[PDB]
Amino acid sequence: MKSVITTVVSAADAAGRFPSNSDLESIQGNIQRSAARLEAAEKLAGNHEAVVKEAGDACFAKYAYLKNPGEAGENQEKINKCYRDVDHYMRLVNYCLVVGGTGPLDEWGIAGAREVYRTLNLPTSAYVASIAYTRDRLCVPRDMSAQAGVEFSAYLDYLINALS
Amino acid sequence: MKSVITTVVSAADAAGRFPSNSDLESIQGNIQRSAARLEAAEKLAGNHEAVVKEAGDACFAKYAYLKNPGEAGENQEKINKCYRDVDHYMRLVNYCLVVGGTGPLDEWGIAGAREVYRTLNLPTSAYVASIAYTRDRLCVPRDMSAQAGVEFSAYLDYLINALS
Amino acid sequence: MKSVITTVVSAADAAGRFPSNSDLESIQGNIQRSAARLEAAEKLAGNHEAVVKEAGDACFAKYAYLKNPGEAGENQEKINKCYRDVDHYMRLVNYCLVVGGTGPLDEWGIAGAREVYRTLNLPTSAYVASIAYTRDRLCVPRDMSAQAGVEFSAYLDYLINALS
Amino acid sequence: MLDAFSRVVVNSDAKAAYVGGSDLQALKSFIADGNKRLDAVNSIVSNASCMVSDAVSGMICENPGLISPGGNCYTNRRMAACLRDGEIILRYVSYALLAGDASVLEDRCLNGLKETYIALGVPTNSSIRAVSIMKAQAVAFITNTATERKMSFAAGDCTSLASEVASYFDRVGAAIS
Amino acid sequence: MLDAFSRVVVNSDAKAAYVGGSDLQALKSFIADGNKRLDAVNSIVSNASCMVSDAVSGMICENPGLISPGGNCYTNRRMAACLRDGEIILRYVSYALLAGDASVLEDRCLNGLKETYIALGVPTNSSIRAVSIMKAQAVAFITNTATERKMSFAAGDCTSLASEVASYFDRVGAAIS
Amino acid sequence: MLDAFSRVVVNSDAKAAYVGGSDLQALKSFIADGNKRLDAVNSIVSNASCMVSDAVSGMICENPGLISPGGNCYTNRRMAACLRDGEIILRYVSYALLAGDASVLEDRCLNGLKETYIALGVPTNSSIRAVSIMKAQAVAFITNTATERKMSFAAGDCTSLASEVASYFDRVGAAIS
Amino acid sequence: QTGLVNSKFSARMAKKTAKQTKNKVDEYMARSVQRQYKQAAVATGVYGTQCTEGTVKGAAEASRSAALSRQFRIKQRSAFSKAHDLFEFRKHAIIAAAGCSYEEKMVTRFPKLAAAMVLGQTEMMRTCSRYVVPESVEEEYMAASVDKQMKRRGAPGGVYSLSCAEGVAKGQAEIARVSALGAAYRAASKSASAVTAERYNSMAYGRVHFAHGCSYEEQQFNKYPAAAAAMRSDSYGY
Amino acid sequence: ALILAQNDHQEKQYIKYPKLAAAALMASTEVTRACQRYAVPESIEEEFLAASVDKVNKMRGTTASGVYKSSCVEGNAKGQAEQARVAALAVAFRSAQKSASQFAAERYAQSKYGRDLFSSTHFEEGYANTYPAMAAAKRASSYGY
Numbered sequence A, B, C: 001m002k003s004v005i006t007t008v009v010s011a012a013d014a015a016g017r018f019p020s021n022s023d024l025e026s027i028q029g030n031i032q033r034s035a036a037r038l039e040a041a042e043k044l045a046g047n048h049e050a051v052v053k054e055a056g057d058a059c060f061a062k063y064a065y066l067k068n069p070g071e072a073g074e075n076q077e078k079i080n081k082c083y084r085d086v087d088h089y090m091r092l093v094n095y096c097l098v099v100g101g102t103g104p105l106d107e108w109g110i111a112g113a114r115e116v117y118r119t120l121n122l123p124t125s126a127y128v129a130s131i132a133y134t135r136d137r138l139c140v141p142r143d144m145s146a147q148a149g150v151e152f153s154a155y156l157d158y159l160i161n162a163l164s
Numbered sequence D, E, F: 001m002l003d004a005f006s007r008v009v010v011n012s013d014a015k016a017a018y019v020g021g022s023d024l025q026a027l028k029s030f031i032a033d034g035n036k037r038l039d040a041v042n043s044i045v046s047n048a049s050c051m052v053s054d055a056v057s058g059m060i061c062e063n064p065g066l067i068s069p070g071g072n073c074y075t076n077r078r079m080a081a082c083l084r085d086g087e088i089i090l091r092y093v094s095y096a097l098l099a100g101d102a103s104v105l106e107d108r109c110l111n112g113l114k115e116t117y118i119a120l121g122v123p124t125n126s127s128i129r130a131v132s133i134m135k136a137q138a139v140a141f142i143t144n145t146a147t148e149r150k151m152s153f154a155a156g157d158c159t160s161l162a163s164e165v166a167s168y169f170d171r172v173g174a175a176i177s
Numbered sequence G: 001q002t003g004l005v006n007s008k009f010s011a012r013m014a015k016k017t018a019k020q021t022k023n024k025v026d027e028y029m030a031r032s033v034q035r036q037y038k039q040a041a042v043a044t045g046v047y048g049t050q051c052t053e054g055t056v057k058g059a060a061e062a063s064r065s066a067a068l069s070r071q072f073r074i075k076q077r078s079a080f081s082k083a084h085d086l087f088e089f090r091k092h093a094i095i096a097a098a099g100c101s102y103e104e105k106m107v108t109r110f111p112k113l114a115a116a117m118v119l120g121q122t123e124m125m126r127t128c129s130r131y132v133v134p135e136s137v138e139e140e141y142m143a144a145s146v147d148k149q150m151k152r153r154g155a156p157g158g159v160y161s162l163s164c165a166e167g168v169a170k171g172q173a174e175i176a177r178v179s180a181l182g183a184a185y186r187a188a189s190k191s192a193s194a195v196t197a198e199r200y201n202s203m204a205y206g207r208v209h210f211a212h213g214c215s216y217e218e219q220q221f222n223k224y225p226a227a228a229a230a231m232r233s234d235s236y237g238y
Numbered sequence H: 001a002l003i004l005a006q007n008d009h010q011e012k013q014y015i016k017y018p019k020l021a022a023a024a025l026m027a028s029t030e031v032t033r034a035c036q037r038y039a040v041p042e043s044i045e046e047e048f049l050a051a052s053v054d055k056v057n058k059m060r061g062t063t064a065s066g067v068y069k070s071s072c073v074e075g076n077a078k079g080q081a082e083q084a085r086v087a088a089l090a091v092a093f094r095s096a097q098k099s100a101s102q103f104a105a106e107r108y109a110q111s112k113y114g115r116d117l118f119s120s121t122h123f124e125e126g127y128a129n130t131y132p133a134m135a136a137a138k139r140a141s142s143y144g145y
């Protein structure tokens, strides 16, 4: 995982040095910002079945061509496999809010994604509409706090920038 | 130089990756504890000439054999160079009170110092008595504030840990 | 530039040998099979303008969602740049018929293609639709000869093996 | 590398003076808006992969000679390399915007890149335009006047940091010219 | 590798659940003792030069058999490597205290080390007496109960941080003996 | 300078042999068709002014990004400096066609033209198209196969001089790339 | 006089220009770094076990004439392949010269210094692909999997480059067999103190040069350091 | 000479006496080595940039019809063409033996010389400050060579 903690230990291991006050002050950033990045942690974990349902069809609302045969949305268990993938992703976005960095998204969702989606005929532009619909439907004082809405959206468009 | 910024900008450049939300979070640690070491800086800069008058003779307090003929501190102008020598090291720890790392130490104060003192016969085991005298000469509500003293002492015994 | 002559003399130059009897014999294969692939070369060259209009609209026949606003066929000049690329791919499959191999595809159409279509948000599943419409549109003794349809279409489904 | 903190250190190292209370008020004001530096550079990195597609295709549609046959953006390997260094320059400008000084720019990116583009036949006159479109895009995302995406920031002034990135893309544009 | 914040991720990924109110009491407490944790690492970075010499000469005063000819401290080359690797495992446990987990020990210190030490002629009885004596030197710095050097700190109980490093030293002293 | 009569005499001077009638067979054949070559060079020079307008405006209509801003034929100074070197290449291959040897071309016009076009930023891929249309205009004027203006000539074959002037234009092309 | 393009008779400006002196300073740091990186091999007065040329009297002189033809093939590279060799050796030396800004400063100027350090720093902590013999076929098939992907840019488009080539003359490549077969045995018959210094430095080499905070690539490198020492720069086509 | 004279007495002396202003140009291009005979291009692409304007400079060495003028002639007796050839290579070799202070002086003096006498535009001073040996190869056009 790549987090705030995991970077400075690898930087000190590269130099062959003890954790000095440059590495010590990086975890000070996990004191003021972890009050806001963990404010949006349980809002996703306590409402994970609501965000998957009315953003997973927003994939299919923009791309309704998948219901024709030969495509990926051609039968119901493929759609039942389709809602699992954005439920996998928002679990990983919740996994990167509680870790501080972008580790669990990188180690488990993005690495190797560009090789599977091309051979299995899965459009990554159809992935990115379900991700980006949760970004602009997010209200800043209603869904979460003000600084948590900046924080949760910043991990969200990293995945948009990962797939495109 | 090693700083809070210059570690994570060099760590993200190792993979060729953008500044992630982990990397902005480490900069947030370099704001709140930056002001702790900042008021230790100009208080040291306003009183630097009086520390070396007490840290200069402290190396000749417990090692009075330096002024013997046959060693490298025998005449008066070498003692004036010895007073100049510790003022460079108290200028270097004033610099890491600004940058928050060990950047102006490990390339300007330690790198090569193990070999110029072994070749010009200046005892490093007696030289560290000058810096470590200033470590316990620290009145944490009278010198400066409290949280400056937990890092200014940490830079000084890092320099004890670097030469020996 | 993977060709018949190029890969047999680079293997000799790897070991530093002269072109031996194993190496002259591969060029002997470029007389018998070179009658068939070169006979399909001016068949594609003499009728290329009727291919890319009548097999270029099969991209938006199946994938009709691209003409919608937002996606890659949203106006005239992005539609016009789509017919240019299948005409670019029709030259590079015509260029592969005369080199005796997979030369001009592997440098000018395949290498780096899987990173351009990601960042330009171009679906490669739409690219293989207009190519596979040309792959099955083959009346075998009427386009070309009986064996000329084998070596012509061998580069077509190699491209679908590359873009997917 | 160095940053804006170590820039006044190596300037004071040349005179061997302690940095007192007089010259640190440039850096006392710098840590006062340290949230503003993170609130500006987060707008760039969130739209980083979409800024280089906005700029390279803006370079093609203004100068169509690169997609001519034989040209510098004709082979599909070459367009992959042009989008490869679109996000390298955008990485290294956002490195310098985060650090506050451009000292990471002319040693790891701009060092030798002028003679590299000359020796590769890269047309540098259109390569200024791919940088200058990123200059007009990074100044739009920071002051939040980008006309397809607005973000949520606290109200205030960020023209001092709008010119911080506008002096960095022009440092790229003056070194490869 | 892992850490403390990544441990509750892979504990939640072991069943593919989320991270909600059940697993967050260990992690919302972790930021509260973070200023205890950052003051614990600052205590151990201050004094690493003598506490390896406290350990590798305390190994001598109970076992002089390595300065006996044919031992492992007879050579001045070998006595550097006992001092060089006396602090690397001290550097790795200070990595583990900053990480909140001993994940960096079982790949960079523990794994390979038993197969290393058979191929060197390493006395395995010297391994356990070196780490357990500097275990008591470690918690004396953490609980500020070092009887020839004191330090200024903020008041409060700290035995939870003393027990966390006490769970690290018996890991590495077990398999290589 | 080495012309066709003097190309062979430095080949004999590499071994210090008297040039004899076994070696004049290439030369007496060369002097026999010298009225055809003077009928060949005159067909180029008498159409030499529009031939660079036939080629450089052929370069613009194939690739319209040269007159685009960022193109290297954009401004009115640069198109004048391209039509100036449109006719230097045609002047220096009429110097090699009249002399029967390309050793007035490879040293008085192209000894250093590769690094000149590199260091100026002149695109190499479009200067090939500037000279290859003049390759196809030479062989239409040598063979009297111009589809808009045919010149009056004595009858007979002239296919060797068309192959010679096309073997001068590729040496322009293979060096500036 | 005027320039050599018109009516002259001898080549001029035979003078030490700025680019020749820039090549002259960079060749001299290449003879200083390769001096200093050989100091760890020959640290005592004797030559070590791995500073050897060959075994056959005709094979020790064939090591130089191969390597003199190897350094011509780096000079014979294309302009795109020289520039990709230029910046990738810049990147792998900042990872090498890690903690110093002054050591980072010198490599950004001098370009043959970058090739000299990262070839020698691979051979100072012996993270080369020749010096490691894996203990079993478990570690060998991990080591044989990674270098075939490192051989996958010897043929970039299925046609071979010059950088992977080892035969330059008639009967040349057979000495290149037996020099590495003896190098494989001397790495296997190395000292027991050195080979466990090899595996720990190579697993510390791969975690900073190629993993970059990846938990999976660090886990296979800590399980198989023989595959970590087979990982090299991609500027080397072989 | 009107645009290198400093005060108005010096530009009055250059007007009344036209033979003085010819050797005033021969004063300034010898105290600052901005001649072609001291021009050393540092590279091959600057050597070719010097030869781009020598062929314009030889075009005024002939007349407009094409006959060779008397201003460009390298011999007047038998063998003087070879004697001028073997001498000019020696002064070309002496132009390569200057000091480092002498090379950096005339490099900043040639680009100074080309951009105040021969730059009405931005591109003529664009070539001069980037390629100073091209600025050294610009004659006054009173000379044929």
Ligand SMILES: C=CC1=C(C)[C@@H](Cc2[nH]c(/C=C3N=C(/C=C4\NC(=O)[C@H](C)[C@H]4CC)C(C)=C\3CCC(=O)O)c(CCC(=O)O)c2C)NC1=O
Pocket: A106, A107, A110, A111, A112, G142, G145, G146, G149, G211, G213, G214, G215, G216, G217, G220, G221, G227
């Ligand atoms: C034998 C053991 C073995 C390994 C340890 C890896 C190591 C490895 N990775 C890559 C190749 C790669 N490695 C990564 C790295 C990662 N990808 C991710 O999803 C993570 C974020 C990160 C791991 C931490 C990426 C993104 C590439 C593709 C781009 C590249 O060539 O670097 C390559 C080049 C050839 C290839 O593509 O396979 C190799 C040897 N591969 C192996 O065969």
Ligand SMILES: C=CC1=C(C)[C@@H](Cc2[nH]c(/C=C3N=C(/C=C4\NC(=O)[C@H](C)[C@H]4CC)C(C)=C\3CCC(=O)O)c(CCC(=O)O)c2C)NC1=O
Pocket: A043, A044, A047, A050, A051, A054, A137, A138, A139, A140, A142, A143, A144
């Ligand atoms: C973790 C993130 C997080 C959230 C996304 C919300 C959870 C949430 N609230 C709504 C539901 C809603 N959200 C809004 C809010 C708005 N609608 C607008 O038109 C305005 C732009 C904006 C106010 C700023 C409204 C008005 C509803 C009810 C209508 C609806 O969307 O169904 C929806 C979609 C419909 C539904 O299932 O109910 C979701 C997932 N709470 C959270 O903790």
Ligand SMILES: C=CC1=C(C)[C@@H](Cc2[nH]c(/C=C3N=C(/C=C4\NC(=O)[C@H](C)[C@H]4CC)C(C)=C\3CCC(=O)O)c(CCC(=O)O)c2C)NC1=O
Pocket: A033, A147, A150, B021, B024, B025, B026, B028, D032, D033, D035, D036, D038, D039, D040, D042, D142, D143, D144, D153, D154, D155, D156, D157, D158, D161
């Ligand atoms: C780890 C990531 C990380 C961040 C992204 C920032 C996030 C951030 N930005 C600001 C705060 C701010 N950000 C801006 C910036 C702007 N306002 C505008 O109108 C312009 C569009 C834009 C200029 C670039 C301003 C004006 C403030 C208020 C000043 C301040 O309190 O710092 C604040 C303080 C107020 C708050 O709590 O919200 C924080 C925490 N900090 C972090 O630690």
Ligand SMILES: C=CC1=C(C)[C@@H](Cc2[nH]c(/C=C3N=C(/C=C4\NC(=O)[C@H](C)[C@H]4CC)C(C)=C\3CCC(=O)O)c(CCC(=O)O)c2C)NC1=O
Pocket: C021, C024, C025, C026, C027, C028
């Ligand atoms: C892999 C090994 C391999 C070869 C060695 C050649 C063998 C070869 N040479 C020729 C055939 C020929 N080769 C030549 C050439 C020459 N004749 C001479 O006396 C000159 C020395 C030389 C002139 C350059 C000629 C003139 C012919 C007959 C005409 C022709 O076939 O075109 C033929 C066709 C006739 C036949 O089938 O026998 C073949 C197969 N091809 C191969 O595939």
Ligand SMILES: C=CC1=C(C)[C@@H](Cc2[nH]c(/C=C3N=C(/C=C4\NC(=O)[C@H](C)[C@H]4CC)C(C)=C\3CCC(=O)O)c(CCC(=O)O)c2C)NC1=O
Pocket: C059, C066, C072, C073, C078, C079, C081, C082, C083, C085, C086, C088, C089, C108, C109, C116, C120, C122, C123, C124, C126, C127, C130, D053, D057, D060, D067, D073, D074, D075, D076, D079
């Ligand atoms: C000779 C090799 C060669 C290629 C393989 C292509 C590849 C290619 N396509 C595009 C660029 C493009 N390509 C398309 C094409 C399509 N989009 C779709 O929805 C369909 C899948 C397809 C039409 C059938 C579009 C719409 C763009 C514009 C994308 C943009 O400008 O952002 C570009 C960027 C420059 C340009 O606009 O041309 C390149 C290099 N071009 C080449 O020169």
Ligand SMILES: C=CC1=C(C)[C@@H](Cc2[nH]c(/C=C3N=C(/C=C4\NC(=O)[C@H](C)[C@H]4CC)C(C)=C\3CCC(=O)O)c(CCC(=O)O)c2C)NC1=O
Pocket: C043, C044, C047, C050, C051, C054, C055, C137, C138, C139, C140, C141, C142, C143
């Ligand atoms: C140079 C490349 C080239 C080919 C690969 C073929 C393929 C081909 N056939 C048709 C067009 C046609 N092709 C056929 C042929 C057939 N229909 C069948 O069901 C049979 C399998 C097969 C008999 C051989 C028929 C009957 C039409 C006319 C129907 C139509 O409009 O598509 C078209 C559309 C334009 C055109 O008429 O040419 C193309 C590209 N023709 C070419 O010029």
Ligand SMILES: C=CC1=C(C)[C@@H](Cc2[nH]c(/C=C3N=C(/C=C4\NC(=O)[C@H](C)[C@H]4CC)C(C)=C\3CCC(=O)O)c(CCC(=O)O)c2C)NC1=O
Pocket: D056, D066, D072, D073, D077, D078, D079, D081, D082, D083, D084, D085, D086, D088, D089, D108, D109, D113, D116, D120, D122, D123, D126, D127, D130, G080, G083, G084, G087
């Ligand atoms: C650390 C610093 C660093 C950089 C700044 C980049 C930049 C960079 N690009 C290229 C290489 C290239 N760069 C381009 C780029 C362009 N051509 C154009 O028409 C556009 C103006 C522009 C893209 C916007 C192209 C087309 C090539 C390939 C040239 C070729 O294939 O011959 C190379 C040579 C190595 C290679 O071929 O990959 C380098 C170093 N990469 C780096 O490592």
Ligand SMILES: C=CC1=C(C)[C@@H](Cc2[nH]c(/C=C3N=C(/C=C4\NC(=O)[C@H](C)[C@H]4CC)C(C)=C\3CCC(=O)O)c(CCC(=O)O)c2C)NC1=O
Pocket: D047, D050, D051, D053, D054, D055, D057, D058, D059, D061, D062, D132, D133, D136, D137, D140, D141, D145, D146, D147, D148, D149
């Ligand atoms: C000839 C063809 C042509 C194009 C392709 C576009 C490309 C383009 N966009 C902008 C200008 C811009 N370009 C972007 C980039 C983007 N917008 C977004 O919201 C996304 C994040 C990203 C695309 C994925 C932004 C944010 C601006 C600022 C204005 C705005 O959109 O709010 C500019 C700068 C204009 C200037 O210099 O004044 C250009 C050239 N314009 C053209 O004339």
Ligand SMILES: C=CC1=C(C)[C@@H](Cc2[nH]c(/C=C3N=C(/C=C4\NC(=O)[C@H](C)[C@H]4CC)C(C)=C\3CCC(=O)O)c(CCC(=O)O)c2C)NC1=O
Pocket: E047, E049, E050, E051, E053, E054, E055, E057, E058, E059, E060, E061, E062, E133, E136, E137, E140, E141, E145, E146, E147, E148, E149
């Ligand atoms: C055989 C020879 C021999 C020695 C060399 C010493 C070494 C030594 N020191 C300690 C015990 C210790 N050693 C240290 C280390 C230090 N103490 C300080 O005050 C400094 C900061 C630092 C020296 C640089 C500390 C902190 C303790 C814990 C007790 C304390 O000092 O308060 C112990 C463990 C005692 C036990 O549990 O039995 C030993 C063996 N004692 C010996 O018997």
Ligand SMILES: C=CC1=C(C)[C@@H](Cc2[nH]c(/C=C3N=C(/C=C4\NC(=O)[C@H](C)[C@H]4CC)C(C)=C\3CCC(=O)O)c(CCC(=O)O)c2C)NC1=O
Pocket: F056, F072, F073, F077, F078, F079, F081, F082, F083, F084, F085, F086, F088, F108, F109, F113, F116, F120, F122, F123, F126, F127, F130, H048, H049, H051, H052, H053, H055, H123
């Ligand atoms: C004796 C040898 C000799 C030559 C071979 C030619 C060619 C030549 N052209 C230019 C100089 C130039 N040459 C061109 C020409 C072109 N740029 C293009 O994009 C097209 C491919 C091509 C026209 C067809 C242009 C546009 C300039 C001016 C560049 C500028 O002003 O920045 C120069 C540099 C000196 C100058 O300013 O003129 C030379 C040597 N002229 C000579 O005297």
Ligand SMILES: C=CC1=C(C)[C@@H](Cc2[nH]c(/C=C3N=C(/C=C4\NC(=O)[C@H](C)[C@H]4CC)C(C)=C\3CCC(=O)O)c(CCC(=O)O)c2C)NC1=O
Pocket: F047, F049, F050, F051, F053, F054, F055, F057, F058, F060, F061, F062, F133, F136, F137, F140, F141, F145, F146, F147, F148, F149
């Ligand atoms: C977009 C703009 C554009 C052009 C400028 C031309 C450029 C051009 N000219 C020719 C081809 C030619 N160009 C000329 C040159 C000339 N012809 C004359 O009669 C004059 C004597 C002289 C101009 C003064 C000649 C002689 C030929 C050979 C065919 C012919 O005209 O007889 C060719 C190759 C064959 C062809 O396609 O025609 C091309 C591409 N074509 C274009 O598409």
Ligand SMILES: C=CC1=C(C)[C@@H](Cc2[nH]c(/C=C3N=C(/C=C4\NC(=O)[C@H](C)[C@H]4CC)C(C)=C\3CCC(=O)O)c(CCC(=O)O)c2C)NC1=O
Pocket: B106, B107, B111, B112, G029, G032, G033, G036, G037, G040, G097, G098, G099, G100, G101, G102, G103, G104, G106, G113, G117
């Ligand atoms: C030609 C240019 C040139 C360089 C750039 C340096 C780079 C360099 N330094 C060292 C060798 C060294 N380099 C350093 C320097 C440092 N180590 C640190 O921990 C500090 C962060 C940093 C100071 C900035 C030290 C202390 C050694 C000796 C021990 C070691 O290798 O770490 C070596 C190996 C030789 C040896 O083992 O002694 C090399 C190649 N040397 C050169 O000849």
Ligand SMILES: C=CC1=C(C)[C@@H](Cc2[nH]c(/C=C3N=C(/C=C4\NC(=O)[C@H](C)[C@H]4CC)C(C)=C\3CCC(=O)O)c(CCC(=O)O)c2C)NC1=O
Pocket: G034, G037, G038, G041, G050, G051, G052, G053, G063, G067, G070, G119, G120, G121, G122, G123, G124, G127, G128, G129, G130, G131, G179, G180, G183, G232, G236
């Ligand atoms: C620092 C001290 C230092 C040394 C003791 C010598 C090490 C050295 N290198 C080579 C000789 C070589 N060494 C390499 C280098 C490598 N080969 C690879 O596969 C890796 C990518 C890379 C580091 C292991 C290469 C490519 C050759 C030439 C071919 C070869 O013999 O392997 C030889 C000749 C014997 C042989 O290998 O056959 C020796 C003694 N060079 C030094 O710089």
Ligand SMILES: CCC1=C(C)[C@@H](CC2=N/C(=C\c3[nH]c(C[C@@H]4NC(=O)C(C)=C4CC)c(C)c3CCC(=O)O)C(CCC(=O)O)=C2C)NC1=O
Pocket: C011, C012, C014, C015, C017, G151, G154, G164, G165, G166, G167, G173, G174, G175, G176, G177, G178, G179, G180, G181, G238
């Ligand atoms: C362990 C040390 C070692 C070797 C390896 C081989 C090296 C070697 N390669 C050969 C021959 C050879 N050499 C290469 C190049 C090389 N091989 C590859 O599989 C790839 C990807 C390569 C570039 C890096 C190829 C591809 C061939 C096969 C071509 C051929 O045999 O003609 C030959 C035969 C030459 C001859 O007989 O004339 C030898 C001896 N010998 C050794 O002592």
